[PDB]
């Protein structure tokens, strides 16, 4: 008979604590949750007590037991003689955070058992189920048990140590200078001075109306990321095959035109310079490319770990697009489905300590206003994603919407929410000849 | 300039970093 | 009892397949290693063969037996006995690669129930180890199975993989001359110039108001197909019976006028040409027609799929109009009903390689704006259709709206939005006449 | 008796001529369906032979007996 490994003791220590010493609740509150306890009489105490604690009752020993006896709940417990035996038998000089702590960790190795035994029923009785299916299914499980433990980092700080922190930090950046990039390097010098580099560990969304050059974009910023690191760079196109993604990266890297590399006609000069580039990326080989449809985010974040397990570390992530993106158990309601995602995308962000860029895209109503250019509020449907990101960029481009711009050739990449920084419209020249997008020469304002 | 900078930075880092700092 | 997960069937099918079918030992190891078997005398038994192909030598019967014998092992294996009881029941129709398949998910399921029980047991024995060293434990016996798996088909592949894919299809365009065509020849040169035909995996979308010409220029497009190919095209024609298209088909093909097929006072040199015509194409013999009505993506799909199987292939597909298409499971809502269409669709052209054109709709207040030319916008309550088509053509006559146009005779195809390349307007010459588009001859700017 | 109207005979030729020759399972998937047949047994064959079909494999006897042990 195997025995799960229970802690009585330490659970009667922590309730004798709080009926003798009702300040250190706090201190039990977050530690312990009233599912951690094994005995059912112990979590309907707890709970109890709870309740009591957060109406302003006291918890001593006459009054828990007494509105136990009202509900009609004392006989399940263990009656009056119970739980002054509990009371009595904990001494007042005891360390209930230690108790509260034995406590939490069995919950999470019972939970783990749980889980374990599940994937081995699963596993014996398919029901159909593919191997594929039980995989994520197992990774799932293990992760679910990993986030119920990671939800402890999260809490209120010193503030003089927040200002010690502080201060540091505008020293250090200010010590270091790096040219004024402290993250991954954007490939472009306004950029980079207005972003500080791609800072890692953070969620970054772009965001433009259809053919503003969102893809265009994100592949500029994926090359010259490659370019200018060592880390591998991986991008995961649910909205192209592979093999248009690397002739838009030909045409961008030997800045030849796209319509000839799409038609072959090419002459020996271009043909030249595409060798180049093939020469130059296979030195390097540090990208990877996954054109698969219909991708879920287990397996966006599984594939994501894979590789920064193979390589130790990664420069950059994209995804494009995230609205191609789906979670199966909650396809009824699309916001659900949507902040899912963006959580899932924040915590993969946080675990791989790498910038993450998702593309996402933006409602006709943004078209039924006299000014187009992009706001915070047309990112409707998405709150989620709002809040969670790190870093959101808007793309405009004038001239699609006028042909008499005189910005023809020229996209702002709009900064509408910077966690570590200042917003604003930074101006880029566009050519849509060679697929790129390159620093403004002209006059800035 | 930049020395004077950093030797003010290393100042008030003495006078009220302590523990962590950097 | 919880019998690990095995098939004794089919590790003997496999067995027996190579003794008596040496070229399919490729299929066999690209599928299965030794460790996936779960008897000891199959992992012997695929060891002993993987050593004698290596060595250069056959792996029938008596080969393996008489290297067996020399070794001793021919006892452990289960004798000549065992081997001939191999050779004897798998027939020669095998197919040895399902057989592998199957035996790699039994043994990828046995490995994970194995994690599992190892992971349960572990957390029931500390031993000394803190919960957080248990699940870096779960977390890596896990991965190790997962980690890259066989999915390299469904995985992120190499820069150089993704590049030689590229650069062979780049040669595989450039090997053929078809002068800038490389999709389905849409039988219009300014066209085909425009969007290098109709690509392969690719959603397109025809879109006018009514009377403009939708289902012409669709049958249209179908004719070209069918005389410039030699794969079969299949319609979908939910409007019109396959009667009336085929009366549409002839009058566009033999230049005969319409109001003269349909009240039936034509001639001999039209008889003729009819019978001409009949004779073309029953001497290619590669159109199929549907006339159903509130088809289903689904049976759209199982009957396309039904076709590629029975004639080798599909060189096109299309279905007039989506408006009158049906989701059961979702007419509360149209425009989800709209979305779901337009995802199967796309769905549908990736898998079967073909191009799909799609009539659809356009809204009223289209007619009210001082240009009716439609534009992107005008395909309202239909955004997911704009947002998941490959390709975008509107139809637009002058003539329909003025009574006074100067391009009488002339319609114009509208590239809303060419996923890669240009856009602009194409000018063809409209004979309603004979029910037919032809090539503009007029002067081009 | 008032008896059921049915016929096991050919459901079993049926059956077995799709497990000897695949290339016919169109020629039946015209004519019936899962929920045409009589019995359970056949029409949890049937419903299995269909899966298999439509995910690209053969219906060979070993095959389909292993995946519907599979299945349980
Ligand atoms: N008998 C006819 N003679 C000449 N033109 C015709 C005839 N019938 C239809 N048309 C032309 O065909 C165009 C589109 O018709 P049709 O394709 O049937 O509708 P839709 O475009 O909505 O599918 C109309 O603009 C009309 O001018
Ligand atoms: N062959 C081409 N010639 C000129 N411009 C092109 C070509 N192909 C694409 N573009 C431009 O690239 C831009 C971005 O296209 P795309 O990436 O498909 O849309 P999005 O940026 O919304 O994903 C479009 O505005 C289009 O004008
Ligand atoms: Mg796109
Ligand atoms: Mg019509």
């Known amino acids: 008979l195997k025995v799960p490994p229970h802690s009585i003791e330490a659970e009667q220590s922590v309730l004798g604590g709080l009926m003798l010493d009702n300040e250190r609740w706090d201190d039990v509150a977050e530690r312990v949750v009233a599912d951690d306890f094994y005995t059912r009489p112990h979590r309907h105490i707890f709970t109890e007590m709870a309740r009591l604690q957060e109406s302003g009752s006291p918890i001593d020993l006459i009054t828990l037991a007494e509105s136990l006896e009202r509900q009609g709940q004392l006989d399940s417990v263990g009656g009056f003689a119970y739980l002054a035996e509990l009371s009595k038998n904990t001494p007042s000089a005891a360390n209930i955070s230690a108790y509260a702590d034995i406590v939490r960790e069995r919950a999470v190795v019972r939970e783990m058992i749980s889980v374990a035994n599940e994937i081995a029923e699963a596993g014996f009785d398919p029901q159909g189920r593919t191997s594929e299916d039980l995989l994520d299914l197992a990774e799932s499980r293990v992760f679910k048990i990993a986030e119920s433990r990671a939800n402890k980092d999260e809490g209120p700080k010193n503030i003089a140590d927040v200002l010690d922190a502080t201060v540091a930090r505008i020293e250090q950046l200010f010590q270091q200078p790096h040219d004024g990039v402290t993250g991954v390097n954007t490939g472009y010098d306004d950029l980079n001075k207005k972003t500080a580099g791609l800072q890692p560990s953070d969620l970054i969304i772009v965001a433009a109306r259809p053919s503003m050059g969102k893809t265009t974009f994100a592949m500029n910023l994926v090359e010259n990321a490659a370019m200018l690191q060592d880390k591998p760079v991986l991008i995961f196109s649910l909205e192209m095959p592979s093999e248009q993604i690397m002739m838009r990266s030909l045409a961008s890297l030997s800045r030849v035109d796209q319509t000839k590399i799409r038609t072959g006609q090419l002459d020996d000069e271009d043909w030249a310079r595409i060798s180049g580039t093939m020469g130059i990326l296979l030195e390097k080989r540090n990208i990877y490319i996954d054109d698969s449809s219909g991708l879920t985010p287990t397996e966006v974040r599984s594939r994501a770990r894979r590789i920064a397990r193979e390589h130790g570390g990664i420069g950059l992530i994209m995804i494009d697009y995230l609205q191609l993106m789906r979670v199966p158990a909650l396809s009824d309601n699309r916001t659900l489905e949507i902040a899912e995602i963006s959580r899932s995308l924040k915590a993969l962000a946080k675990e791989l300590n790498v910038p993450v860029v998702a593309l996402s895209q933006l409602n006709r109503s943004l078209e039924q206003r006299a000014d187009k250019r992009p706001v915070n509020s047309d990112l409707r449907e998405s709150g989620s994603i709002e809040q969670d990101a790190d870093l959101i960029m808007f793309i405009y481009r004038d001239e699609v919407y006028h042909e008499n711009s005189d910005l023809k050739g020229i996209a702002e990449i709009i900064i509408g929410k910077q966690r570590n920084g200042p917003i604003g419209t930074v101006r880029l020249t566009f050519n849509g000849q060679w697929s790129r997008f390159d620093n403004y020469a002209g006059p800035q304002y | ?22």
Chains 1, 3 share one sequence.
């Open chain 2, 1 to 22: 300039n930049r020395a004077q900078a950093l030797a003010k930075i290393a100042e008030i880092k003495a006078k009220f970093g302590l523990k962590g700092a950097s």
